[PDB]
Amino acid sequence: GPHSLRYFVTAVSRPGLGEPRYMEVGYVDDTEFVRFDSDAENPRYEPRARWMEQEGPEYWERETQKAKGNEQSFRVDLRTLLGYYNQSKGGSHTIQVISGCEVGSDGRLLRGYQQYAYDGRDYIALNEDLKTWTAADMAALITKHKWEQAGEAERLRAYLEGTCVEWLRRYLKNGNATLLRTDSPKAHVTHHSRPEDKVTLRCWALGFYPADITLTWQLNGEELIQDMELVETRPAGDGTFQKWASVVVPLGKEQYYTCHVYHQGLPEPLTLRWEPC
Amino acid sequence: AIVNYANL
Amino acid sequence: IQRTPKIQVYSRHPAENGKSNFLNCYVSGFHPSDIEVDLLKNGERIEKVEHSDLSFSKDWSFYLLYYTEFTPTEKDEYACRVNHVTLSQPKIVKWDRDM
Description:
The complex is a heterotrimer. Chain A folds into two domains: about 1-180, 2-Layer Sandwich (Murine Class I Major Histocompatibility Complex, H2-DB, Chain A, domain 1), CATH 3.30.500; about 180-275, Immunoglobulin-like (Sandwich), CATH 2.60.40. Helix content of chain A is about 25%, strand content about 40%. Chain A has helices at about 55-85, 140-150, 150-175; strands at about 5-10, 20-30, 30-35, 45, 95-105, 110-120, 120-125, 135, 185-195, 200-210, 215-220, 230, 235, 240-250, 255-260, 270. In chain A, the strands form three sheets. Chain A has an eight-stranded antiparallel beta sheet with strand order 4-3-2-1-5-6-7-8, covered by helices on one side. In chain A, strands 9, 10, 12, 13 and 14 form a five-stranded antiparallel beta sheet that branches. In chain A, strand 13 (about 235) and strand 14 (about 240-250) form a beta hairpin. Helix content of chain B is about 0%, strand content about 0%. The N and C termini of chain C lie far apart (about 30 Å). Chain C has strands at about 5-10, 20-30, 35-40, 45, 50, 55, 60-70, 80-85, 90-95. Chain C contains no helices and nine strands. In chain C, a hairpin with a 7-residue loop joins strand 8 (about 80-85) and strand 9 (about 90-95). By secondary structure, chain C is an all-beta fold. Chains in contact: A-B, A-C. Chain A: It is found in: Membrane. Chain A: It is a single-pass type I membrane protein.
């Protein structure tokens, strides 16, 4: 460990255009491994990683049937929320849920998640104790009451501490993946002349995974140079990520600036500078 | 395997 | 609460004129999920464009990648055009090979 199994669920109503769009996406350690989408040619659970192709037909059938049951349940929820918020039958609305477990290297649950959003805003969430709920507003208070009455927190706790953990263990064994996957970034600095004897130094990090990364520019050493341009981390399209940070510096001073790249794949932080020619 | 959701 | 898309247009690999490559338009941080994305070459929609399956982040905003194979030249101009319920007008972002 540590490892995690998480499901991201989406239900989107589209009145006038048919039944809601319903999707479930599963992630082992932040890598998608299964997907259900009601809008697919054939609505069924699909392997999204090669190692999942190992699972037999009964698994696919059972999970597909659960998805279909879940789908029906969210159709009902979408209507319920319309009532709670006194909204019209004509609008399009969205329920999202994140559900799952993060387990520590000792194989014990670190945290369980059961979090709901409505129209992109927190609606209700299971607290870290896995016993109580945090409702975001008065509508969620209705749900909170229902679930308190039904012992929902206890049902979820059994799922999160038991079932979720156990499946994660099986999925990891399927993938032969108990060491987290990592690709170290490869970095370089590009040089772009600007008018009036100025120079853009752009420090690139390419081909890294997972996405989490930090880039900094330093003057000499220990400089937390503030006014960098920076782009949000972005997918390259081949499974890896890209990022850059730049500074503008005086022509002839490039050699005093240092770029630093911090990533879990690296034996230690990278340091680099512009390489003239 | 995903959890079975209860109604809101 | 509705969130307008962030948009980046960029190549998979450092651009070299005449070398085959991939042009990406990454759209993220938006809500709700319906969105329209076109990659354009000299103002004309590129037809052979694919996109990733829809996902969302922990802050409940959606994201996806639109991409196409292309071969950059000196004079060809590429852009990404995005429409979303939060935008009064389609948003156009030009490809700058240095970014």
